[PDB]
Amino acid sequence: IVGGYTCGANTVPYQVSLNSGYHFCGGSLINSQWVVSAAHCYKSGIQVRLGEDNINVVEGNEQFISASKSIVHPSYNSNTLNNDIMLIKLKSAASLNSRVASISLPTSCASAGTQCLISGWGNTKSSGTSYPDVLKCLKAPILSDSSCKSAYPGQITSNMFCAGYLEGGKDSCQGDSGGPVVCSGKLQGIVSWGSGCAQKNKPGVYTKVCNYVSWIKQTIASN
């Protein structure tokens, strides 16, 4: 997260870190045994880490649970990043509490102008590289489809939205991939892609979660 703030320990209780020897992606806990992330975060040997703040220190509220299976969206295209969504099932159910909690799926799509919270352990520099070890947060508005399409001609599908600031300086970045965009207590987006981070006229692009609720519910119900 570039241009954000330190969230505060366990203030984003649905935020998970995906770990394969090291943090490589974010995710969102949507019930006691399922996590939503980006399809481009797919790999084998995933351990889900819940209750994290400093991802380099065991602080006492963590639960570490290996994934039993991952399900990438059947229509995911890794070239265009259309349908950039994946479900991860935990080998055992997380113990839910005030610091480890699921986030509700949307019942309706959020509109341009809606204020959202984007979070993660990604790069905090738009040119350099610096990884925070504590969770970072950014408040950002959803942008209009027209401005999103104008920023990225030929690349924005009906399964994507832009959020952030056309002026630059505030954005999600490398390592935030797969993480939450939460608006009014609902998971509306997944950190997906962009052209660099926090660059002028290149806002972050996010998977439009409201388009996938039926798929998520049906997949969970049979897996």
The contact set with Ca ion (CB under 5 A) reads: 52, 54, 59
CA distance 156 to 177: 17
Choose the catalytic residue: 28, 40, 70, 176.
Answer: 40
Q: What angle do CA 138, 104, 17 make, to 5 degrees?
A: 55
Q: Which is nearer to ligand SZ1, 193 or 212 (CB)?
A: 193
Rank residues 51 and 121 by Cβ distance to ligand SZ1 and give the closer one. 121
Q: Name the catalytic one among 73, 84, 102, 192.
A: 84
DSSP letters spanning 39-76:
GGG--SS-EEEES-SSTTS--S--EEEEEEEEEE-TT-
Tokens of 6: 């330190």
Tell me which of 177, 181, 188, 189 binds ligand SZ1, using CB under 6 A: 177
Cα separation, 26 vs 36, whole angstroms: 9
Q: Tell me which residues in 132-171 interact with ligand SZ1 (CB under 6 A).
A: 171
Classify 3 as helix, strand or coil.
coil
176 is catalytic: no
Instruction: Return the residues of window 184-213 that contact ligand SZ1 according to CB under 6 A.
Output: 191, 193-194, 197, 204
CA 199 to each of CA 126, 165, 222: distance values in angstroms, whole numbers, following the listed order: 7, 9, 42
Euclidean distance between CA atoms 115 and 200, whole angstroms: 20
Residue 53 bears catalytic tag: no
Count of residues that interact with ligand SZ1, criterion CB under 6 A: 11
Whether 177 is catalytic: yes
Which residues are designated catalytic? 40, 84, 177
Binding residues for Ca(2+): 52, 54, 57, 62
- Residues near ligand SZ1, by CB under 6 A: 171-174, 176-177, 191, 193-194, 197, 204
